[PDB]
Amino acid sequence: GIFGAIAGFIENGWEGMIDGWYGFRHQNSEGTGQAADLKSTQAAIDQINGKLNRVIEKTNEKFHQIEKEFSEVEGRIQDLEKYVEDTKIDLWSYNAELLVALENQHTIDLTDSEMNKLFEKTRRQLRENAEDMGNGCFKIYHKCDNACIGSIRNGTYDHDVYRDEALNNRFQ
Amino acid sequence: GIFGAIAGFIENGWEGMIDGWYGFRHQNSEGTGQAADLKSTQAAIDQINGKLNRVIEKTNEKFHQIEKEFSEVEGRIQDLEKYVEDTKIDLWSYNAELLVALENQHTIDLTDSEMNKLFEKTRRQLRENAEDMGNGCFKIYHKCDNACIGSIRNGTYDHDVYRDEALNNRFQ
Amino acid sequence: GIFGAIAGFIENGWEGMIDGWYGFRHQNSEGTGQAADLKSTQAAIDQINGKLNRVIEKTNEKFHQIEKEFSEVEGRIQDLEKYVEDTKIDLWSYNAELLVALENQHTIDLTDSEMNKLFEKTRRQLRENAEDMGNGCFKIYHKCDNACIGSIRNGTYDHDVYRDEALNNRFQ
Amino acid sequence: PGNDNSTATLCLGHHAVPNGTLVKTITNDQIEVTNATELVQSSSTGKICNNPHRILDGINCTLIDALLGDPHCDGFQNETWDLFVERSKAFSNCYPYDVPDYASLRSLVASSGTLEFINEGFTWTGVTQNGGSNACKRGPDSGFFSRLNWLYKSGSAYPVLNVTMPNNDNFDKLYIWGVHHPSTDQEQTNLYVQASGRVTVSTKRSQQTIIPNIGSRPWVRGLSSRISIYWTIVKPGDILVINSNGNLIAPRGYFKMRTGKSSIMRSDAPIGTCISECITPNGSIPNDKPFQNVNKITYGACPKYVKQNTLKLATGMRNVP
Amino acid sequence: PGNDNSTATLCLGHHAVPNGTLVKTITNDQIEVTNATELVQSSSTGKICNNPHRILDGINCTLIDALLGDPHCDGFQNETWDLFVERSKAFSNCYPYDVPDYASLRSLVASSGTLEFINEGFTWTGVTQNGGSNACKRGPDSGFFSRLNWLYKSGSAYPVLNVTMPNNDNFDKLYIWGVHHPSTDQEQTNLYVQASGRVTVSTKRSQQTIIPNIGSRPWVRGLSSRISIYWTIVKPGDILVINSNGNLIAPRGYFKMRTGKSSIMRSDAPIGTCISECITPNGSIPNDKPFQNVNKITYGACPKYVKQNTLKLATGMRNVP
Amino acid sequence: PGNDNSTATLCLGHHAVPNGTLVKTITNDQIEVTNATELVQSSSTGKICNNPHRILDGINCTLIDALLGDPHCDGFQNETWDLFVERSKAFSNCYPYDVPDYASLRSLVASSGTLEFINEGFTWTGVTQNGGSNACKRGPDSGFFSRLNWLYKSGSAYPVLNVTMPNNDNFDKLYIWGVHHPSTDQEQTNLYVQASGRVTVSTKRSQQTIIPNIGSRPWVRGLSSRISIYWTIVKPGDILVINSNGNLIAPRGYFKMRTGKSSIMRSDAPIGTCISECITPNGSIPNDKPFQNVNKITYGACPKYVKQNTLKLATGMRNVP
Ligand SMILES: *[C@@H]1O[C@H](CO)[C@@H](O[C@@H]2O[C@H](CO)[C@@H](O[C@@H]3O[C@H](CO)[C@@H](O)[C@H](O)[C@@H]3O)[C@H](O)[C@H]2NC(C)=O)[C@H](O)[C@H]1NC(C)=O
Ligand SMILES: *[C@@H]1O[C@H](CO)[C@@H](O[C@@H]2O[C@H](CO)[C@@H](O[C@@H]3O[C@H](CO)[C@@H](O)[C@H](O)[C@@H]3O)[C@H](O)[C@H]2NC(C)=O)[C@H](O)[C@H]1NC(C)=O
Ligand SMILES: *[C@@H]1O[C@H](CO)[C@@H](O[C@@H]2O[C@H](CO)[C@@H](O[C@@H]3O[C@H](CO)[C@@H](O)[C@H](O)[C@@H]3O)[C@H](O)[C@H]2NC(C)=O)[C@H](O)[C@H]1NC(C)=O
Ligand SMILES: *[C@@H]1O[C@H](CO)[C@@H](O[C@@H]2O[C@H](CO)[C@@H](O)[C@H](O)[C@H]2NC(C)=O)[C@H](O)[C@H]1NC(C)=O
Ligand SMILES: *[C@@H]1O[C@H](CO)[C@@H](O[C@@H]2O[C@H](CO)[C@@H](O)[C@H](O)[C@H]2NC(C)=O)[C@H](O)[C@H]1NC(C)=O
Ligand SMILES: *[C@@H]1O[C@H](CO)[C@@H](O[C@@H]2O[C@H](CO)[C@@H](O)[C@H](O)[C@H]2NC(C)=O)[C@H](O)[C@H]1NC(C)=O
Ligand SMILES: *[C@@H]1O[C@H](CO)[C@@H](O)[C@H](O)[C@H]1NC(C)=O
Ligand SMILES: *[C@@H]1O[C@H](CO)[C@@H](O)[C@H](O)[C@H]1NC(C)=O
Ligand SMILES: *[C@@H]1O[C@H](CO)[C@@H](O)[C@H](O)[C@H]1NC(C)=O
Ligand SMILES: *[C@H]1O[C@H](CO)[C@@H](O)[C@H](O)[C@H]1NC(C)=O
Ligand SMILES: *[C@H]1O[C@H](CO)[C@@H](O)[C@H](O)[C@H]1NC(C)=O
Ligand SMILES: *[C@H]1O[C@H](CO)[C@@H](O)[C@H](O)[C@H]1NC(C)=O
């Protein structure tokens, strides 16, 4: 029973993030906080809406076709009509099964990817001022108040400003 | 002809690992050693068994159908019966070809991924105590006996214990 | 309007690279330069030629089939002939649509992957002598003339030679 | 309490829900995602919406009885439809008949989409017209199919009938005609004099020729006799010839043929005052989903029939506690 | 010797085998993996396993000869089957016959799955029953199809035959009957008096009516004459009427119809004492694989036919030396 | 100017073009790539290349008129083809005729691939041979279908015709024959004496038997009479028997049947002096692409027909400015 330590995406999701799909949780001098990342959130949504527009890219319109139920036994021609239709249904049933499996694999992959993409982006910002804790979190080796964390989420963090302070905490 | 140096997954597999799909080889004060990683091994196997259960997700049962060979020339109706069947076979033949290609692409991708996933996991454990040699191996910048290597494979390696010793070897 | 700074693949392509698909741009004591990387270039091309050989893996030869246009109204049999053919076309039309979408997704993925693969390869060469600037470029923390950059592109860069000089520039 | 003032922790994460749902992938058979959507339509309202397709409810009539002009189907004269609906309660109540290749005539009429009928002035020299039967009551009087003309002896003979009707129009004409099969060799002569009639109906490139067959069939509405129904389509520029020795059940004109989106469906589903593009025998179904397992029989803009009753498309990431 | 005591090397790696196998991917046409499995079944045992489907070996008999009751097929009376097997050595040895739409009768009987036959007490007033022929020997005596009744003149006439048989049962009845075509205009009168017989077989909604044709056909088992075989299905609540002037080859009763999983296959493969769900004309094949290129003709739980003779599914990682 | 002499910048990058092209993916509906290629063939040259398939241009003749031997189609005697091309301008100019199941005869002849005809020495005792008609002029003289023999009365009678022709060959023989339908009951007796002819054509296992029908049809080239065309295939070891009372339009021999790659196509496209594997009614199309939306009707090694007019396959990376 450990409350207090925050943790990242490595084998845990955040039930408490209801204003976005991806985001940051921080712990610093001023306490803790949380903020969604709209950009990666929107990127996942756009991709998923696209598949779901293409999958629903409008039905086929069919009118007069062939009969598919029969009140009389007839032999050869009816056999063929039933076989044609059974063949069509099995092939479409296969198409549907495969489509869903492929699309769901892809949905999972692209959502995982957005997550990792946001991690790497953050890591690139931090340069030598932080280390990967291994749990989806960075240890930032300098005083980083709410405004500081904000600059990271905002993409305006200047690593040079804190570099001396951080290198000193990391090593010597 | 260089025997002595060990090497990692970067463009070489280990023919000598027969108790697992993925693993560690080490070289330290006590000599060399090798140990499979069951978890990533099991993860690849589970995924592959799943595809191979879904691909073999039981045959279609068909009974009375249409005739497909003919002893007499007949024209229009036979033409149609042959065309219906030729059409079905070509479509299923296509399905099979594509399925295998897609599934094999995926099998290769997920097995490569498990490999890289185990590398990154190890890298995260090591923090600042090791460097990526570029060949799938880490240079661990501190005395790491068999028990030490064991703690890495076991996931109980404490980077803090060795941090001072390693940072000193890496830099100053 | 900033000319002078060079930049990497992070959200920008190089219109000025006409002798390869992937490559290096550098800036050093001797000025700037650019060189294609043939290996990753060839790897993308080979993969794309493969798909484009398999997609064009030769047409199906068909001869006598069924009639598909009719000058007279006939009812049941013609209905079936039209339905058989409409069914075939819709299924192949679906196959084609899906194939192209899947293949194009894959083409994009494998080309992105080659890019990132060349970045990581370079990063592994550089060890502790460089830092990721975040824009697809490395800051190399030592004097690296044209010959030096060449050794990096050539895969013969010895990180040890420059390590002391670089660690000193990076930190102390 | 509180953490050191010298460092900070910044974690990256994704949302999760307490109510995840299981979907299928290539990798795994059951993986939990944050949200998903059904791709198989498996329910119907139970009603055939009468908008936007024109639905013609056959009620007590099959399309063929509406075509021939069975008296209780008189309300269908010259009717049109996108989809004709035949009900299981439908019944025939005219001269007992059969249609060799019933299904083809039903199909081609269904697809043509109209019973628009045009009277033509056939001259029938030497025979009596408008024969009626007690098995085809039209009020209290004996009667017959509205679109058919039961010809029989006049005075005491039945001259070889022999007439023509050119198609000088721009559309195909459909002619419905018949051959009468009396039950007794004594019924045959009594109506048509000759002991073995014939009906030859021809165009320039085609001909049908039918010989009647005397004999008793099962009693239907008082009768062991039958009529067999045939049809002939006459293209623009072509000519219809009708030659008969007897037993001819003559057409009174033609049905104008069309091409288009018209069809026919067997269903007992009530007609609904509502709007739906996709129609099944179960009733109309929505078409927002790409697939459906309601019925392989459909009409209009419909999801494709599949065997699965459910297919869940992930619309969110993997759900992880 | 040995490495420094100040550092260590820890390498990550994956296994590899000396016997890799080539598979196909999207990326590459031939990539070596550590292991793979065949998805196309391309071999058969060469035997049709008689378990778990009931296999009925026709031996010298086609299903139609078993149906009609060709004497050497008498052992098939009232037989049932999941899969009837017709052999290339089969032969007919009764009255020479043809079946217009042979394939449909063969199909519907195959699918019904039984030759369960019920005798009905047809009364045939004024004619002689049980005619026999030297072309259909039944021992040393002339004989005929067991399920058919060759009617002919009695005294010196052949009165218009006219009988009925209602279906007061819950199942469909299949009636098999025939029309005799004599070879000479003198054979016709000698058997049936009338010079041009007719056979009309009818229910309430359907009728078939056949006129014989006198003339010589190729000599078969002594004969230039033929019988043509027809059928009629009578639904519950409906009635069969049979009217004939002559040349009628009468049914002796009906075959009880069923629906189910029964079929028919042409094969010369021996029947095997073994177990297999999937049957092909080559013999039974295993069904562990999703596909097969043994035969497009199959029965039971089978892999799907495809044109490829091999498809290798990777079941291991890329093999790298 | 210039950068510090203490460091260097090394950037990794990929090319981009100023003229990117949009393709479709799973992820996005329109993504710009550096280059792509069309997979749907949507154009034709407009000409049917006469290489490498043997193209036989029917010109004024349908395959059936070439088969029967309509005089203006005499140039097609014994012709062969990979693909027979029927033109919309084709016309008949012989005795007015119909073919019940025209489409099947046209199909089986098309697929057989030859009109190779062998004369057989049919003996026709007691009748007159080689009847000719003004509706089938052969020069200035009345004439008839080359492959057919119009038989009629000799002296003053028409004896029951009755002949045989065994197949002692290794191939199937196709026999084309006919039945004449006179327009008047007085035309019938005048040609054939009997008042109701018959034609029975039989092998050991099959028979067709046709009764003519007297009556007027629409005037065609002077005539209200018709001939109806039938066929019979005789397998090796089997025997053809032809029995007729009158109205027989007799074959003069058989057409040798083959199996192979031959077919027939309706097209008005000019024949081209060029080379193409794939043929459509629009003309030949290249087959470098996997798909095509030119025509669902094709012959030879062709791309598969699809509904899309364009499908762009990326052949380069994402294009980024
Ligand atoms: C769980 O996933 C489903 C997947 O579709 C989500 O349902 C969809 O939600 C969107 C947004 O509310 C709906 O789009 C909207 O449709 C209306 C209809 O006109 C339109 O006016 C709006 O502008 C917008 O495009 C969409 O229809 C709806 N789909 C279904 C099948 O209901 C759902 O939002 C997800 N749930 C959560 C909690 O995220
Ligand atoms: C090479 O790949 C094939 C891919 O299937 C592997 O073959 C499979 O091996 C497994 C494990 O031995 C078999 O599963 C077992 O089946 C029995 C049958 O009842 C069951 O009782 C066991 O509990 C287990 O589920 C599987 O049947 C077998 N598949 C085939 C087609 O033979 C094979 O192991 C791989 N080779 C190596 C060296 O890894
Ligand atoms: C844009 O993408 C298309 C995708 O195919 C590229 O077109 C292809 O270019 C290659 C190389 O020039 C062609 O291959 C060659 O074909 C000839 C034909 O015999 C052969 O002799 C050569 O050895 C080589 O294999 C290929 O045919 C051609 N495909 C098409 C459809 O034209 C094109 O190069 C790309 N454009 C750029 C600027 O990269
Ligand atoms: C729609 O109607 C069809 C039949 O018209 C229903 O399918 C039948 O379902 C019952 C009960 O499951 C089965 O006993 C029958 O065998 C089915 N018939 C056929 C032809 O498959 C179907 O269940 C109905 N669906 C809905 C949603 O009403
Ligand atoms: C199973 O039987 C079929 C035929 O019943 C075989 O297919 C034939 O194979 C031969 C030799 O390759 C060809 O000459 C024929 O053209 C094929 N016939 C057809 C209809 O395709 C098949 O090879 C047999 N397979 C096995 C495994 O026994
Ligand atoms: C090839 O020919 C076909 C017809 O033989 C053309 O298809 C027709 O196209 C016209 C104009 O678009 C339509 O009005 C017809 O309805 C189409 N007919 C059919 C049967 O679909 C086709 O456009 C031609 N294509 C080329 C490239 O010449
Ligand atoms: C349909 O027929 C029934 C009798 O079978 C009759 O009672 C009913 O009124 C008829 N419906 C209409 C609309 O005429
Ligand atoms: C099948 O017929 C042959 C003669 O053709 C006969 O010798 C054999 O005994 C028959 N088989 C059976 C089981 O009666
Ligand atoms: C085809 O027929 C027309 C008349 O319809 C004729 O003028 C033309 O010469 C004919 N073509 C050939 C090749 O005989
Ligand atoms: C139906 O339309 C035809 C075509 O004009 C017309 O002649 C006929 O009188 C109409 N009948 C009814 C009942 O409206
Ligand atoms: C076959 O079954 C029927 C139906 O009961 C029975 O009447 C008949 O006698 C049986 N015949 C044989 C040979 O078992
Ligand atoms: C066509 O071939 C047949 C078969 O040998 C031959 O008898 C006939 O004379 C040939 N006819 C022509 C016109 O070449």
UniProtKB/Swiss-Prot annotation, chains A, B, C:
Disulfide bonds: 144-148
Domain of life: Viruses
Glycosylation sites: 154
Record-given protein name: Hemagglutinin HA2 chain
Organism: Influenza A virus (strain A/Port Chalmers/1/1973 H3N2)
Gene (name only): HA
Section of the entire sequence shown: 346 to 517 of 566
